[PDB]
């Protein structure tokens, strides 16, 4: 094996959140090592976060991590336009991806 072979610990859990509330999208990885975890909006193919840096200028978006295993993206003050698919990405070669859905009520 490669001494570092990151993998997704679990699939992303779909989330439903009412308008104006906060939602959290969590991606759980194993053995991340020196690799980088990124969050993207699938519908608009927009880069949201990379590691602990928020890339989007959308100030409603933040990123937090616990032990480099849990990567939780938070979306403040949900708008109905936030509904859709979100992708969690690891910069392995080949890259790894999984998707979860944020539903807005």
């Amino acid at each position: 094996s490669r001494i570092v072979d990151p993998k997704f610990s679990s699939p992303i859990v779909n989330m439903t959140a009412p308008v104006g509330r906060d939602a959290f999208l969590t991606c759980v990885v194993q053995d991340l090592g020196p690799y980088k975890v990124a969050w993207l909006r699938v519908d608009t193919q927009t880069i949201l976060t990379i590691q602990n840096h928020v890339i989007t200028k959308n100030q409603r978006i933040g990123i937090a991590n616990s032990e480099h295993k849990t990567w939780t993206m938070r979306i403040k003050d949900i708008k109905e336009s936030d509904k859709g698919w979100y992708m969690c990405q690891i910069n392995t070669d080949p890259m790894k991806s999984q998707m979860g859905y944020l539903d807005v009520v």
Binding site: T44, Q45, T46, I47, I55, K57, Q89, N91
Partner: protein, 108 residues
């Protein structure tokens, strides 16, 4: 009113064909960048390639050539294979994003 966002320079080639193994260059020129940042992504699988000065992908064939202060965000693709053919996007991290699509063809 004028938001004074960045803007692309459209006077660049956007449909590029290289022979297999021949290095390819994708020219994205972004003016008035301000506090924004420019990224390259591979549209087929939504793979992040570069973000600002940093390279995200571990595929060492991808690098962004940009001198400090310049508007040129050239994506360099060394040793291309037919697998690399497809659409690549130069995106600006505005809300909502600004994007410019590029078609890259690798011929045998």
């Amino acid at each position: 009113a004028d938001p004074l966002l960045p803007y692309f320079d459209f006077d660049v080639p956007r449909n590029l064909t290289v022979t297999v193994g021949q290095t390819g260059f994708l020219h994205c020129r972004v003016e008035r960048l301000g506090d924004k940042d420019v990224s390259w992504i591979r549209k087929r699988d939504l793979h992040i390639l570069t973000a600002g000065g940093t390279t995200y992908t571990s595929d060492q064939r991808f690098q962004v050539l940009r001198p400090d202060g310049s508007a040129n965000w050239t994506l360099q693709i060394k040793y291309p294979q037919p697998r690399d053919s497809g659409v690549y996007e130069c995106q600006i991290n505005t809300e909502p994003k600004m994007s410019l699509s590029y078609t890259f063809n690798v011929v045998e």
